Amino acid sequence: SIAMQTLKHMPGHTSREVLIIFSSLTTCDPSNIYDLIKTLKAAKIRVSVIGLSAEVRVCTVLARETGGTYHVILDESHYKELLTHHVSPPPASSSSEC
Amino acid sequence: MDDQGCPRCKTTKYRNPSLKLMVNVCGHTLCESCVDLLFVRGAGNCPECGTPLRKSNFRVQLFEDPTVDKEVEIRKKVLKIYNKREEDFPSLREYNDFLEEVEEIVFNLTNNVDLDNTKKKMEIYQKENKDVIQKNKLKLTREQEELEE
Amino acid sequence: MKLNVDGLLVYFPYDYIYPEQFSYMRELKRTLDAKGHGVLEMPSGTGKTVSLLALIMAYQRAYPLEVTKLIYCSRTVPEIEKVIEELRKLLNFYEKQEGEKLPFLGLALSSRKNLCIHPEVTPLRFGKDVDGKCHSLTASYVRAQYQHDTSLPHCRFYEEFDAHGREVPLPAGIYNLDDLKALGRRQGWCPYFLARYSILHANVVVYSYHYLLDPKIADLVSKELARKAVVVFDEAHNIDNVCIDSMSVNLTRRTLDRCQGNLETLQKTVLRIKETDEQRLRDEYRRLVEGANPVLPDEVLQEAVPGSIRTAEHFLGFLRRLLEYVKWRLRVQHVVQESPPAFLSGLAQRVCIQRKPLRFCAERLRSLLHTLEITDLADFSPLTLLANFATLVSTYAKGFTIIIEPFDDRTPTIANPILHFSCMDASLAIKPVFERFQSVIITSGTLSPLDIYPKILDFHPVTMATFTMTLARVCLCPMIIGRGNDQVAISSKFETREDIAVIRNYGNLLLEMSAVVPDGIVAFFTSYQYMESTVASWYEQGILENIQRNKLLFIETQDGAETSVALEKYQEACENGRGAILLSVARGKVSEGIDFVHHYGRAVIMFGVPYVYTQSRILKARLEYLRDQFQIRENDFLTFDAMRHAAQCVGRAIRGKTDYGLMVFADKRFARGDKRGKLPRWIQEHLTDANLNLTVDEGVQVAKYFLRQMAQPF
Ligand code: SF4
Ligand SMILES: [Zn+2]
Ligand SMILES: [Zn+2]
Secondary structure, three states: OHHHHHHHOOOOOOOOEEOOEEOOOOOOOOOOHHHHHHHHHHHOOEEOOEEOOOOOHHHHHHHHHHOOOOEEOOOHHHHHHHHHHHHOOOOOOOOOOO | OOOOOOOOOOOHHHHOOOOOEEEOOOOOOOOHHHHHHHHHOOOOEOOOOOOEOOOOOOEEEOOOOHHHHHHHHHHHHHHOOOOOOHHHOOOOOHHHHHHHHHHHHHHHHHOOOOHHHHHHHHHHHHHHOOOHHHHHHHHHHHHHHHHHO | OEEEOOOOEEEOOOOOOOHHHHHHHHHHHHHHHHOOOEEEEOOOOOOHHHHHHHHHHHHHHHOOOOOOOEEEEOOOHHHHHHHHHHHHHHHHHHHHHHOOOOOOEEEEOOOOOOOOOOOOOOOOOOHHHHHHHHHHHOOHHHHHHHHHOOOOOOOHHHHHHHHHOOOOOOOOEEEOHHHHHHHHHHHOOOHHHHHHHHOOOOOEEEOOHHHOOOHHHHHHHOOHHHOOOEEEEEOHHHHHHHHHHOOOOOEEHHHHHHHHHHHHHHHHHHHHHHHHOOHHHHHHHHHHHHOOOOOOOOOOOOOOOOOOOOOHHHHHHHHHHHHHHHHHHHHOOOOOEEOHHHHHHHHHHHHOOOHHHHHOHHHHHHHHHHHOOOOOOOOOHHHHHHHHHHHHHHHOOOOOOOEEEOOOOOOOOOOOOEEEOOOOOOHHHHHHHHHHOOEEEEEEOOOOOOOHHHHHOOOOOOOEEEOOOOOOOOOEOOEEEEEOOOOOEOOOOOOOOOOHHHHHHHHHHHHHHHHHOOOOEEEEEOOHHHHHHHHHHHHHOOHHHHHHHHOEEEEOOOOHHHHHHHHHHHHHHHHOOOOEEEEEEOOOHHHHHOOOOOOOOOEEEEEOOOOOOOOOHHHHHHHHHHHHOOOOOHHHHHHHHHHHHHHHHHOHHHOOOOOOEEEEEEOHHHHOHHHHHHOOHHHHHHOOOOOOOEEHHHHHHHHHHHHHHHHOOO
């Protein structure tokens, strides 16, 4: 929600992206996140979670529905590879506009 | 033992269930502490009904239903008659027709006058007592002994 | 995807099949070719249905005369719905391949309560109530009165069905239960009776066991029409228990009192009938002299003559006598008594009730009660249950036993004693299926080793093969934890149940496993009392609060409403990131009914080997009789009953679609060779000695690593 509040007023041309480095599998939230997923899809904010020591189901659906990618750390060397891969710009999909 | 109590003295049936029903020609609930009360005065008379009894007409039973008491006793007496085995009759219907007449006799004796039943039973006596009653009566002990083991 | 099976060519909808599927198909074709009953096990919850259905359809096409039809039975209607979905997909694929419709019909049967279109019976959900209301609406008396067309609510659907469906049968197609309800509404016919008639000409019929095992209702729809049909039972590893339940009848004091009240009402109704209409209803006596459904199977059932009970009053008196005998025999206070033949002999001697007249008691009850034009059978149902018991006891007691419990368990003194008539061997009741049908395939998942099943059920199997799931990735990584952080034995023995150290080890293991495992976890205990004791100990200690902080916790209770609400919230918790820890009992109906899939019950925890209490006397008869006959050791059967139950309650996570998941058994007993040997082959082969007896911490670490491995894509 904080990221969405800041990114809502961002220009349409730029690609709004979020990389959640998830460590604790639990997610205690005041409101259901499935509803927020709809707003994220409407706002075309790509969310690509990187889980740690857990294949979180809510984050899996978040990533695939919002267009981002989900990954889990095999080790520190693979963590380096994951973040270095995320460095590069992501391809623009149909929803993306220039 | 689940009965609330005797129609007159419902104290033992609450304190202890050891008392058992006593069957009578009246088909009429009674309890030993009340059997003493019947013995003291009348000596074989139902308290409310006043039905006479030859010698107290008392035998131990444990069926709360007086109708079942009378029916079971009457059936016990009737079984001494018409005890011929089924295989004695090759006819299919006759296997259970006579049993139908037997149970009709039982129901007749339970409520309706038993004079006709007694006359009929005399008629069946004169014929059955010669062979069938004696034979089945003797074979009852043999079959029971074999079945028990 | 056309597979060139050794026997023939078989179509298949999905793109690829694992080698275990090839093995399954070839073994199944071998059994069908031998035309002999057999048993086989396949791991996957889904996929086995499609492979089996495709092979059966191809075999039917190749040798239509060999197999008349397929009778595929499933545990529950919610489960059989998935089967009908699979069959619909397969039929659509085959129809697309062929390019035209073919004379193939497939349908599912279910209770009138589950499916019906009458608004009066719609609001009511209780099955006996639906049965009684439908019997009243469809009664021969109601039909005759409908012929008169008098002012009275008549169920038009059955009449229209009799008018039309009798003449025209449904051409072909696949109809789920819900879709069949819509079809019945559209055509003004019964979704139930229409399917019942289609059973005569249907290629595939699917219904639960209680539609095919209990002689009361099974026989009528499983008549000799299917002389040579492929009958298949799916996931029917708990077939012995259901087959026993189909025979066991429980008599209680409250039920007996209700029976007595119903009998009084019966007598009053008989008097009213005598004063109102006597001759027309007396014609029943003539047809009886000429000579709720009977519980006697095909050959055991007899219809020579009703017996000495030939009139309403005579039958009523007979029932009064038997009810009085049962009432007193139950009121007796004493130790548990067993008496299969002695009960019948004592009944006959004490109350003068001959076994032959007692045999036809239930059938004559059905006929006489029909004569009375009663409002419904729901009110008199207890009397019908008592009559079924009365006829069964006089029918046979060679492989049965009457148990009397003056005192119930869990109560030092209770005024509601219970008389059980639990069976001891399921072969007696399942004999008609094997004998009538040329071959029966008991396809099951999580099956405890097949060798026992022929001993319990008297049949000669053709094939005995165990199929192991093979995938490019190790979907399942089961483990057994017997040593805690204290290196102390963690067996959940009866004498070791009270051990606070063992309870603490279980709590700490659950805490760490919930900390590492992703959202969704289910833990199965051995009994409600044991689960409550462990939960209370954890509550007294701080472990439970830490578990609550780490993840949400839900618990199961005997009440079905609370169970359903808790499971409904558990599903939402699994969907969300909170996660959930569902504590349940292995014998709980929730464990058998529920199915765990991807992101549901990810890590299955088994706290203690599931063993039934060693005091329930019913199991004593069931077990010592098996020792005496068929020669099964008591310990052997007990361990088999534990391992089969554990496999049932732990095999859900591998449902289908290759969804990862780990099965952890927190009990050193599972590490024993006998338990491992009796464990299903597919789980055991994956299990290895390296992880056989991991400590709590080591198990947690390996679980974390395995979850890491499974997280990444293929
Ligand atoms: S006759 Fe058909 S429509 Fe009427 S209550 Fe019975 S099942 Fe329902
Ligand atoms: Zn008295
Ligand atoms: Zn009297």
